[PDB]
Amino acid sequence: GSVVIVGRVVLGEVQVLSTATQSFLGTAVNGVMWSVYHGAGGKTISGPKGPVNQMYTNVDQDLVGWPAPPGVKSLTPCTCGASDLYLVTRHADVVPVRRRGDTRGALLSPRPISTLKGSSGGPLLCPMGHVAGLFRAAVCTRGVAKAVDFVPVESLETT
Ligand SMILES: CC(C)(C)[C@@H]1NC(=O)O[C@@H]2CCC[C@H]2OC/C=C/C(F)(F)c2nc3ccccc3nc2O[C@@H]2C[C@@H](C(=O)N[C@]3(C(=O)NS(=O)(=O)C4(C)CC4)C[C@H]3C(F)F)N(C2)C1=O
Ligand SMILES: [Zn+2]
């Protein structure tokens, strides 16, 4: 009934989040751990200090957020306007992406969908290591990922 922190990806650190049936990622920005609604639902984030309710919940945008747990450092938002980005997966893979719009990025080389599965909520990073977006969905054809869809970092604000 809650989301648990089961691991992390060391870049800053991306959180590996899991429910009873699904595992995905969480990215802390502006004091908030952001993730995807299709993974966490409206569930709380659990831990030794007790469950903590989501402070942001947007079903339409597939975006949820909790107050950053103690110790979860926030990543710096990208302000350099880069279009050459890097998707960080739950396996610590860093996949180059060319931004082609406000929420879309093309992959330089198609990757099987199985290799991106479970990395929703992970960050897209600019060449400076700053978070430009948050992995939400993949453009899939013949089971091969050719592009990604992400929540822009600008939408990851407190209010
Ligand atoms: C074909 C496909 C790849 C399955 C699918 N593509 C797709 O739909 O592309 C279209 C065209 C371009 C953008 C997108 O427009 C529709 C928007 C979908 C959405 F994302 F906004 C979304 N909003 C929701 C809001 C509320 C409740 C449920 C929602 N469900 C959604 O979408 C669903 C979920 C999302 C997903 O699987 N994301 C990833 C992932 O890893 N998840 S996960 O960790 O393993 C896991 C399931 C444990 C949590 C990162 C991609 C990985 F697999 F590469 N989906 C389906 C897809 O990506
Ligand atoms: Zn940047």
Resolution in A: 2.3
Surface-to-core class of residue 80, CB atoms within 10 Å of its CB (0-12 exposed, 13-18 middle, 19+ buried): exposed
Give whole-number Cα distances, 6 to 10, 12, 25, 45, 65, in Å. 13, 17, 10, 11, 17
49 Cα: distance to centroid of ligand 1 (angstroms) = 31
Long-range pairs, 132-141, Cβ under 8 A, ≥24: 132/77, 132/78, 132/82, 132/85, 132/99, 133/85, 133/103, 133/105, 134/27, 134/34, 134/36, 134/63, 135/25, 135/36, 135/87, 136/36, 136/62, 136/63, 136/103, 137/62, 138/113, 139/104, 140/113
- Which one is catalytic: 23, 35, 62, 119? 62
Give the count of beta carbons closer than 10 Å to the beta carbon of residue 27: 30
Give whole-number Cα distances, 143 to 30, 66, 88, 124, in Å. 35, 32, 20, 22
CA-nearest of 118, 98, 94 to 108 is: 98
Separation CA 41–CA 89 (nearest Å): 20
84-155: which CATH architecture?
Beta Barrel (2.40)
120 Cα: distance to centroid of ligand 1 (angstroms) = 8
138 Cα: distance to centroid of ligand 1 (angstroms) = 6
The residues spanned by each domain of the chain are: 2-67, 84-155
Separation CA 152–CA 89 (nearest Å): 17
Nearest CA to ligand 1 atom 11: 139
Test site for ligand 1: of 91, 102, 120, most ligand atoms within 8 A of the Cβ: 120
Q: Is 140 annotated as a binding residue?
A: no
**Distance, CA of 17 to chain centre:** 10
Same fold, 2-67 and 84-155: yes
Cα dihedral value 156, 56, 72, 131, nearest 10: -10
**What distance, in Å, lies between the first and last C-alpha atoms of the chain?**
26
Separation CA 15–CA 124 (nearest Å): 14
Assigned token pair, 17 = 């989040």
From the candidate CATH numbers 2.40.10.120, 3.40.640.10, 3.40.50.300, 1.10.10.60, the one assigned to the domain spanning 2-67? 2.40.10.120
CA-nearest of 149, 119, 151, 117 to 132 is: 151
Experimental technique, in short, is X-ray
**Distance, CA of 55 to chain centre:** 17
Q: Is 78 annotated as a binding residue?
A: yes
